[PDB]
Symmetry: D2
Subunit: 304 residues, 4 copies
């Protein structure tokens, strides 16, 4: 019957995801964490919103890895966050989690959030043994939400009506594709030609998109709501078989001249997991930038 | 408090609109019609769905034009449907309705559905005296829903993820812009280059889009659900101040080289009605087609 | 993946159900009917609302009974509508439909609408061979929606906040239980004691509830929106495993002193179909009325 | 146009409320707090979910009280949390906030969360000068959500289908009314008679309801999701004119033999704020308990 969604890590992102799953009645939720009892407390709190939301999703905490058994969807946020130093430690967490996925829920659809996400997703893919269409990493949905939002406020249009592509990787080497931005399905260049938005404003918006997490932390907060909603958009596309075109970290098998590595690109998410991998027909200049993102991913992969 | 939505015409489209307004809790509804008591029957039926939908919208019928008083939104579907012969008769209906709008609800936001919509909308604009940003006609949201749906089924992606533009007019001279079709924000030409869809399939989809109403009637049905949902998407964008980019019939003041006439183009719909009129930067070939659509509109305008 | 919902009968109720399923993204829909091509026309129209609704449900028509194969949910509205004369004819339709359910989708959850529903549901249960927890008839959700709505308008409270029970059967012998009416969970008698509503107003509301279909038809309309939304509330409770307490026609095995017959009572609808049959602890006066409803059901059963 | 919702206090409850308002597209949000820049960080994060949620709500932070100007709805969570010692300090915060409400948004609808809520709500009512129908305190929606949820899990029914009343005050002296609990509109005593639930289980559920916040904190968490969703259910009932029957802290003018004090009771919330105050017809035993709750409120009022 209902989907079982196990959230491996019950921190701030985990809490908002659980909240949103009950709001949308997506399925039973398990808030798993290594910290004793905390996930039970959050689960209990969150379970009462079933009344207000008119839903019927069980929300429970867990301090045991075998509660992954029966998982339809597994969302990994667990991990430590000399950033390079944390690579091996987080690799160890992916290993342990991957062994339990292979044993307890080999058919689950896996979403990795732990940073560097393009690295951690491939590690978990390797340690869990799941098919390449059943594991993705969060990146482009979150990154493009900022880009799309900022442009929509300049243009005074509904945020969803702006569409944009950010590829290669999550993080500071993300590749923003100015050429692939649209507003109500209309190329953004038309709005630049009409002076509704300038290139210089768009340049500032790009830098702000790239540095948004830093901007939030400099304001004495931490990004967890947008990330959680972006993760749930991806999870919901799988569970409801929406087949939405969402930019995620996925195994590259030749696209962009790249193989044996995970990178961000538009994919189609449906009941079969990653049903399609869409390769944008980038020019040599966008390609060069894509290469830089992949190289940084490889560099960090080599230290894990 | 709640918005008051008066539906002038309580036929099949009127019935589905009332259904959808209660489903979405948009506002109180008045089902108005010249036919005695029928709108009361439909309203009564529809009023009970408040229980199932968890909403609180009053739904009442009306056989009196002064029930337009206080209208926030007015949706006109009333009219007869030698098609040219009906022009003057439907003009007479717009006149009568327009006099009551001027008198009873001059500040209402008006959506005209009655065909030929690009003609009837301008007539009602003239007889009602409302500002040009407060009256639009249904066209492109409905026409592009077919185009977007058909392409999404070939491509196996979520229907909303395909975006397309159909301009000029509603009806057989609608202008389909192949160049402005995107899939997940990605130009459709990329999918044609990749052989995921061919030009010949797209040619068949275009003809099917243009002839969809005829196709439904040849199948012994009549199009009323899609039209109703498209009308409600437009009405909801106004009421909730969504500022969605929606293609509607609106007064052209120079765009595309055209003035003093209504034609379909992407507009932004928010709390100020038509907040923006977006002029696509068409080439001479798309422009020529746009001209043909406007000329047919003018031809029928001259017979009303 | 997605649920497959087959609507056996593609008339007015069928059309609104298909509309609501796409609105709520419930599953793929098959509009089946004996009439050539009409279900194809309605399906086509309805399929375009996927764009406006942000959903991804396939909507197709069918003139073939084997399209029931794979059905998760089957909703029967097909039938002719000297009312006693139609009993055998509608029994013949249930027979034919029941043989195809047994052959094509024996594990489907079945909702019968065809009138007299308490009769037709048992007939289809017998001819289809499905388990008693997998077949129900529409009655109390629809009947109580009117009662709950009318009281909420007198009391000026949200319609869903009024709860009421109507049992025994659908139709003119429905049993309205004044004692089981609540407002925000508070006994209705308190509001009568406070003079917020009188017994005489409630008496008029009861008669109006019983005669609502007649009232709609006397107003030159026909009840199909409320029935459709009530059917979808029931279907959605099954599909999403909501476990909502909904009053439906179900097999009585001793409740109310009655066996081997279908009658309306509160049931719990979840992933296991009818998970619970709730027997209200009626007094002898409510019981007598319940008996009269069952006797009329038996009388019509004997003529089929 | 859109409602302006000012959240005075941008902590954990404030963050979830902002999240839920964008999810439901309720209106523009201001996250106000005395802490420098933090509300800006949370607002920024939360603003990006407009893309994922298909909504268009502005979300901004504020460190200035005059941003209350134009507020339609104001939700107060600000305050320190020898508990008696904090009374005067929180009274000082209500004073300051109340002066700004009177000056900047005298027509706003106010929801107070700060504890002891039944005390703080009356203080803010007095310092802000707003009409008694325009200020309420959070209590019963939150408290009954636990009670309703726990019973629904024992009974295996949808959480919303259980309705219950907790009155008098929020906090340890809350009055749980066993007599006013229903399941699908059916008295809970019927389920006790049928042995579906026992009195002893219900006794444990009552104690758990009363001690839920303590239970969450003993589990190393803190209650903020349920409280936030309960606050939003109340705010949404006002904004959308739902007229839902919700138990809130409101000015008592004679009900239950009590005056000049705020206490929890079912109220109707619509566009006119508190449209109705429903007085339950309690017996002398429930009344005695209600008195104890009011006395504790008065005791703490006298120390502020």
């Amino acid at each position: 019957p209902k989907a079982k969604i196990v959230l491996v890590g019950s921190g701030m992102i985990g809490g908002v995801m659980a909240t949103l799953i009950v709001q949308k009645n997506l399925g039973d939720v398990v808030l798993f964490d290594i910290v004793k009892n905390m996930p039970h407390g959050k689960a209990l709190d969150t379970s009462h919103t079933n009344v207000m939301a008119y839903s019927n999703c069980k929300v429970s905490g867990s301090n045991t890895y075998d509660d992954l058994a029966g998982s339809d969807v597994v969302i990994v946020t667990a991990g430590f966050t000399n950033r390079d130093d944390l690579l091996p430690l987080n690799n160890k967490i992916m290993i342990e989690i991957g062994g339990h996925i292979k044993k307890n829920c080999p058919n689950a659809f896996i979403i990795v959030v732990t940073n560097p996400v393009d690295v951690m997703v491939q590690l978990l893919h390797q340690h869990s043994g799941v098919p390449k269409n059943k594991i993705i990493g969060l990146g482009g949905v979150l990154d493009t939400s900022r880009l799309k939002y900022y442009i929509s406020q300049k243009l005074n249009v509904c945020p969803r009506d702006v569409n944009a592509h950010i590829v290669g990787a999550h993080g500071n080497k993300m590749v923003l594709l100015k050429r692939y931005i649209t507003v109500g399905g209309i190329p953004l260049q038309e709005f630049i030609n009409n002076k509704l938005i300038s290139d210089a404003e768009l340049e500032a918006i790009f830098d702000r998109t790239v540095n948004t997490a830093l901007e939030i932390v400099n304001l004495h907060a931490s990004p967890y709501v947008a990330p959680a909603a972006a993760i749930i958009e991806m999870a919901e596309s799988y569970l409801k078989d929406l087949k939405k075109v969402l930019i995620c970290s996925t195994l590259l098998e030749g696209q962009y001249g790249h193989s044996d590595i995970f990178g961000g690109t538009p994919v189609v998410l449906g009941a079969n997991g990653v049903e399609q991998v869409i390769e944008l027909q980038l020019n040599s200049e966008e390609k060069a930038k894509f290469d830089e993102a992949i190289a940084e991913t490889k560099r960090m992969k080599a230290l894990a």
